[PDB]
């Protein structure tokens with residue numbers, strides 16, 4: 001009960017910054033996650049024994065894929081922790097509880113393939129879930145793990161609080177479908193600019209939490225250039241393997257997934273920062289002003305990608 005997780009000094013300070021990299025030591029990531037729940041949510045939010053057992057079941061259910069792996073899940077939870085800690089009073093007790101859990105679970109049992117490849121492959125999951133296929137799977141895996149004996153970290157919540165936290169988690173994980181991000185940001189943009197954006201309207205909150213999930217999910221672009229550049233390599237390792245599988249089905253993949261178009265990567269990144277990342281962190285900064293460092297870091301990494309094209313690195 002009076003057992004506070006602490007981290008070494010360098011981690012203790014840098015884990016508060018948006019650009020923190022969780023490091024290459026896999027065995028510290030669980031404790032990094034508990035530290036963030038204890039500081040963000042409180043040391044009373046979860047029974048430590050149920051949480052530690054939930055985390056190791058979630059770890060065991062991520063695959064050894066190059067990018068959509070356990071390290072991605074903890075990276076995404078850290079970004080959310082940073083947003084929650086810089087926006088302390090704006091969020092409910094259930095929201096802080098649910099959103100760090102949602103982030104840790106948002107890519108559960110990912111295979112390293114897009115919703116598109118499952119649909120073209122005709123995967124069973126594509127029959128069961130026709131849209132946001134992997135994301136409905138990720139939420140279904142999350143419910144499965146909570147229902148393992150000893151694993152219900154929400155045991156102490158009332159029946160109504162329970163249904164509300166699982167609804168937050170569900171919307172949170174569905175929101176990580178990048179296909180739903182474009183329409184979600186446009187509506188938030190309109191509601192902020194016109195001026196009807198209302199954090200008491202539950203449908204409005206959902207949209208904000210949605211944008212935060214995209215923000216945390218894309219957060220490789222808000223890191224130190226070497227982290228951003230090396231994560232990119234793991235992102236393209238999955239995309240090019242999907243490209244190979246597409247070719248095996250007799251379908252030329254989109255250039256993004258074609259290893260034969262590596263040369264065009266720097267230009268593909270410009271598109272992504274301009275079409276997806278920068279709009280995401282801009283609307284996020286407009287709605288939640290203290291998330292500005294994500295936007296500053298993102299603009300910095302777009303500038304680094306322009307230098308690659310100019311041949312200066």
Ligand SMILES: Cn1cc(C(=O)N2CCOCC2)c(C(=O)Nc2cc3nc(-c4ccccc4)cn3cc2C#N)n1
Nearest residue numbers: 178218219220221235255256261264265268269272276
């Ligand atoms: C952090 N983080 C997350 C993602 C990401 O997208 N997702 C998360 C992982 O799951 C699928 C979604 C990226 C990213 O790099 N995204 C894209 C890269 C890209 N390269 C080309 C390209 C390359 C060569 C030639 C032409 C185009 C196109 N193009 C589109 C993209 C998008 N969107 N970075």
Ligand SMILES: [Mg+2]
Nearest residue numbers: 106107134176
């Ligand atoms: Mg995902």
Ligand SMILES: [Zn+2]
Nearest residue numbers: 072106107217
């Ligand atoms: Zn993800």
